[PDB]
Enzyme design. Structure first.
Site, PDB file in Angstrom:
ATOM      1  N   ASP A 146      13.303  40.371  35.899  1.00  0.00           N
ATOM      2  CA  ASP A 146      14.736  40.275  36.177  1.00  0.00           C
ATOM      3  C   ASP A 146      15.454  41.615  36.081  1.00  0.00           C
ATOM      4  O   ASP A 146      16.502  41.723  35.443  1.00  0.00           O
ATOM      5  CB  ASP A 146      15.398  39.274  35.223  1.00  0.00           C
ATOM      6  CG  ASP A 146      16.757  38.800  35.723  1.00  0.00           C
ATOM      7  OD1 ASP A 146      17.110  39.098  36.887  1.00  0.00           O
ATOM      8  OD2 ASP A 146      17.469  38.127  34.950  1.00  0.00           O
ATOM      9  N   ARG A 150      23.071  43.603  35.708  1.00  0.00           N
ATOM     10  CA  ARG A 150      23.661  42.812  34.624  1.00  0.00           C
ATOM     11  C   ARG A 150      22.803  42.910  33.361  1.00  0.00           C
ATOM     12  O   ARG A 150      23.261  42.598  32.257  1.00  0.00           O
ATOM     13  CB  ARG A 150      23.790  41.338  35.044  1.00  0.00           C
ATOM     14  CG  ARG A 150      22.445  40.640  35.228  1.00  0.00           C
ATOM     15  CD  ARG A 150      22.574  39.209  35.756  1.00  0.00           C
ATOM     16  NE  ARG A 150      21.274  38.714  36.216  1.00  0.00           N
ATOM     17  CZ  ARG A 150      20.820  38.853  37.461  1.00  0.00           C
ATOM     18  NH1 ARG A 150      21.564  39.463  38.374  1.00  0.00           N
ATOM     19  NH2 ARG A 150      19.614  38.409  37.792  1.00  0.00           N
ATOM     20  N   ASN A 151      21.554  43.343  33.526  1.00  0.00           N
ATOM     21  CA  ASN A 151      20.623  43.398  32.404  1.00  0.00           C
ATOM     22  C   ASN A 151      20.422  44.806  31.845  1.00  0.00           C
ATOM     23  O   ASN A 151      19.567  45.023  30.986  1.00  0.00           O
ATOM     24  CB  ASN A 151      19.278  42.788  32.810  1.00  0.00           C
ATOM     25  CG  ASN A 151      19.357  41.283  32.975  1.00  0.00           C
ATOM     26  OD1 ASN A 151      20.167  40.625  32.323  1.00  0.00           O
ATOM     27  ND2 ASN A 151      18.522  40.732  33.849  1.00  0.00           N
ATOM     28  N   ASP A 167      18.118  43.431  28.307  1.00  0.00           N
ATOM     29  CA  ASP A 167      17.853  41.996  28.228  1.00  0.00           C
ATOM     30  C   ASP A 167      16.452  41.662  28.727  1.00  0.00           C
ATOM     31  O   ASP A 167      15.995  42.218  29.727  1.00  0.00           O
ATOM     32  CB  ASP A 167      18.878  41.217  29.051  1.00  0.00           C
ATOM     33  CG  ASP A 167      18.637  39.716  29.006  1.00  0.00           C
ATOM     34  OD1 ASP A 167      17.837  39.202  29.819  1.00  0.00           O
ATOM     35  OD2 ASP A 167      19.248  39.047  28.152  1.00  0.00           O
TER      36      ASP A 167
HETATM   37  C1  AWF Z   1      29.895  46.630  24.023  1.00  0.00           C
HETATM   38  C2  AWF Z   1      29.424  45.752  25.137  1.00  0.00           C
HETATM   39  N1  AWF Z   1      30.385  45.380  26.071  1.00  0.00           N
HETATM   40  C3  AWF Z   1      29.870  44.607  27.008  1.00  0.00           C
HETATM   41  C4  AWF Z   1      30.676  44.030  28.153  1.00  0.00           C
HETATM   42  C5  AWF Z   1      31.761  43.101  27.588  1.00  0.00           C
HETATM   43  C6  AWF Z   1      31.302  45.133  29.004  1.00  0.00           C
HETATM   44  O1  AWF Z   1      29.826  43.241  28.999  1.00  0.00           O
HETATM   45  S1  AWF Z   1      28.200  44.288  26.825  1.00  0.00           S
HETATM   46  C7  AWF Z   1      28.137  45.244  25.379  1.00  0.00           C
HETATM   47  C8  AWF Z   1      26.839  45.365  24.673  1.00  0.00           C
HETATM   48  C9  AWF Z   1      26.417  46.502  23.951  1.00  0.00           C
HETATM   49  N2  AWF Z   1      25.202  46.589  23.302  1.00  0.00           N
HETATM   50  C10 AWF Z   1      24.330  45.513  23.350  1.00  0.00           C
HETATM   51  N3  AWF Z   1      23.086  45.617  22.686  1.00  0.00           N
HETATM   52  C11 AWF Z   1      24.658  44.325  24.049  1.00  0.00           C
HETATM   53  O2  AWF Z   1      23.713  43.306  24.041  1.00  0.00           O
HETATM   54  C12 AWF Z   1      23.930  42.030  24.731  1.00  0.00           C
HETATM   55  C13 AWF Z   1      22.900  41.053  24.142  1.00  0.00           C
HETATM   56  C14 AWF Z   1      23.781  42.160  26.266  1.00  0.00           C
HETATM   57  C15 AWF Z   1      22.642  42.902  26.757  1.00  0.00           C
HETATM   58  C16 AWF Z   1      22.425  43.085  28.141  1.00  0.00           C
HETATM   59  F1  AWF Z   1      21.358  43.782  28.558  1.00  0.00           F
HETATM   60  C17 AWF Z   1      23.314  42.550  29.088  1.00  0.00           C
HETATM   61  C18 AWF Z   1      24.441  41.818  28.650  1.00  0.00           C
HETATM   62  C19 AWF Z   1      24.693  41.612  27.252  1.00  0.00           C
HETATM   63  N4  AWF Z   1      25.869  40.855  26.941  1.00  0.00           N
HETATM   64  N5  AWF Z   1      27.101  41.228  27.409  1.00  0.00           N
HETATM   65  C20 AWF Z   1      27.898  40.286  26.908  1.00  0.00           C
HETATM   66  C21 AWF Z   1      27.145  39.382  26.165  1.00  0.00           C
HETATM   67  N6  AWF Z   1      25.856  39.736  26.181  1.00  0.00           N
HETATM   68  C22 AWF Z   1      25.922  44.291  24.696  1.00  0.00           C
END
Ligand code: AWF
Length: 292
Positions: A146, A150-151, A167
């Site tokens: 994937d 978005r990931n 992700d």
């Molecule tokens: C500060 C921050 N702001 C974001 C906005 C709101 C702009 O989207 S994401 C983010 C962030 C920073 N560090 C991470 N480790 C992290 O991890 C999560 C599990 C994650 C990992 C991905 F690969 C993709 C998406 C997501 N995710 N996004 C929202 C909920 N889950 C997110």
């Protein structure tokens, strides 16, 4: 407790670094299970497991903890630890202050207010960063399944940003569901037709990510549904270049989208070509479109 093998070695839930719950403070939601910004002072992203979930959901959660904790690469998000001995259960990740790539591209598109907020070289560096992560996965025989904007996550908003794969929920599901949930717009024909996944799966998906990056965050195959994409791509159809996209960069995309998996480049080659693009003045001197 489930087992997990990566780079040979087998690991178990016992190998996860448990962080005492008392050391963990939640700060704010980031998006919804739910993810919070937290502190342990180390700033963390806290991925939570809903206390109301199926045993399959629990196993999925444990498995992605195992998966991420076992990677060691600069372009894959770090896992600080877990908190599994309290409810709800937490996975603690490196907090990437730049947020996810897709939101970043959308919010940072150059505009009349910020004409040069972003340049071709910035996009090429993001592309290179993720390709380096993909190369690491490839050489360790891990198929992501994937690869998509978005990931991916960014360390910061500014020019020094580093992109990382953040992700691994898809690779988790298949390691152990529905059609309208499969990321068909990021999948090669043999993947969505035959369920065959190889390292060359991720190459195709990376081409689509490349398109997402240079389109500055547009959804792939504009105006097409999943089924229309399936039929389009199966018939030899491919996306047109993003607006203002340099030919050398589009050429990387079209090579990633070769119908035969053996005809598609591995990530060492993709990295070579991305490198060439960054050296080519005709590429990096090209202005990104300005959104009015
Ligand atoms: C500060 C921050 N702001 C974001 C906005 C709101 C702009 O989207 S994401 C983010 C962030 C920073 N560090 C991470 N480790 C992290 O991890 C999560 C599990 C994650 C990992 C991905 F690969 C993709 C998406 C997501 N995710 N996004 C929202 C909920 N889950 C997110």
């Amino acid at each position: 407790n489930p087992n997990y093998c990566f780079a040979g070695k087998t690991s178990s839930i016992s190998d996860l670094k448990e962080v005492p719950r008392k050391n963990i403070t939640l700060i704010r939601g980031l998006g919804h299970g739910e993810v919070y910004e937290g502190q342990v002072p180390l700033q963390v992203a806290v991925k939570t497991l809903p206390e109301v979930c199926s045993e399959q959901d629990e196993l999925d959660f444990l498995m992605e903890a195992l998966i991420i904790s076992k990677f060691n690469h600069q372009n894959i998000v770090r896992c600080i630890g877990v908190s599994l001995q309290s409810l709800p259960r937490f996975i603690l990740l490196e907090l990437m202050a730049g947020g996810d790539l897709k939101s970043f591209l959308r919010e940072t598109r150059p505009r009349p207010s910020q004409p040069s907020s972003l340049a071709m070289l910035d996009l090429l560096h993001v592309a290179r960063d993720i390709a380096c992560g993909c190369q690491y996965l490839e050489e360790n025989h891990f198929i992501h399944r994937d690869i998509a904007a978005r990931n991916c996550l960014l360390t910061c908003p500014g020019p020094g940003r580093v992109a990382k794969i953040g992700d691994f929920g898809m690779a988790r599901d298949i390691y152990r569901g529905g059609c309208a949930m499969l990321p068909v717009k990021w999948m090669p024909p043999e993947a969505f037709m035959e369920g065959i996944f190889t390292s060359k799966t991720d190459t195709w998906s990376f081409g689509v990510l490349l398109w997402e990056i240079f389109s500055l965050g547009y959804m792939p195959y504009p105006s097409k549904s999943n089924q229309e994409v399936l039929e389009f791509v199966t018939s030899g159809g491919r996306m047109d270049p993003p607006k203002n996209c340099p030919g050398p960069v589009y050429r990387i995309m079209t090579q990633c989208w070769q119908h035969q998996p053996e005809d598609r480049p591995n990530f060492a080659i993709i990295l070579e070509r991305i490198e060439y693009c960054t050296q080519d003045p005709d590429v990096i001197n090209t202005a990104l479109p300005i959104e009015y």
